[PDB]
From Swiss-Prot:
Similarity comment text for this entry: Belongs to the glycosyl hydrolase 7 (cellulase C) family.
Parent-protein residues present: 478 to 513 of 513
Highest classification ranks of the organism: Eukaryota, Fungi, Dikarya, Ascomycota, Pezizomycotina
Name of protein: Exoglucanase 1
Posttranslational mods: N-glycosylated. The catalytic core domain comprises three N-linked glycans which each consist of a single N-acetylglucosamine residue.
Ranges of residues in domain CBM1: 1-36
S-S pairs: 8-25, 19-35
Superkingdom: Eukaryota
Glycosylation sites: 1, 3, 14
Record's comment describing the protein's domains: The enzyme consists of two functional domains, a catalytic core joined to a carbohydrate-binding domain (CBM) by a serine-, threonine-, and proline-rich, highly glycosylated linker sequence.
Function: Exocellobiohydrolases (CBH) that catalyzes the hydrolysis of 1,4-beta-D-glucosidic bonds in cellulose to release the disaccharide cellobiose. The degradation of cellulose involves an interplay between different cellulolytic enzymes. Hydrolysis starts with endoglucanases (EGs), which cut internal beta-1,4-glucosidic bonds in cellulose to reduce the polymerization degree of the substrate and create new chain ends for exocellobiohydrolases (CBHs). The CBHs release the disaccharide cellobiose from the non-reducing end of the cellulose polymer chain.
Subcellular location as annotated: Secreted
Further remark: T.reesei produces two different exocellobiohydrolases. They are unique in that they can hydrolyze crystalline cellulose in the absence of endoglucanases.
Length: 36
């Protein structure tokens, strides 16, 4: 899984798109899905 503060999604986003537990794959803005 992806670590705390590591980016998860948003801007048609590739790479480690699956967060660690406790933290959420966020939706702060359309581009900004992060592990918070």
């Amino acid at each position: 899984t992806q670590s705390h503060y590591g980016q998860c999604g948003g801007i048609g986003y590739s790479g480690p798109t699956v967060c660690a537990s406790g933290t959420t794959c966020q939706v702060l803005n359309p581009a900004y899905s992060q592990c918070l």
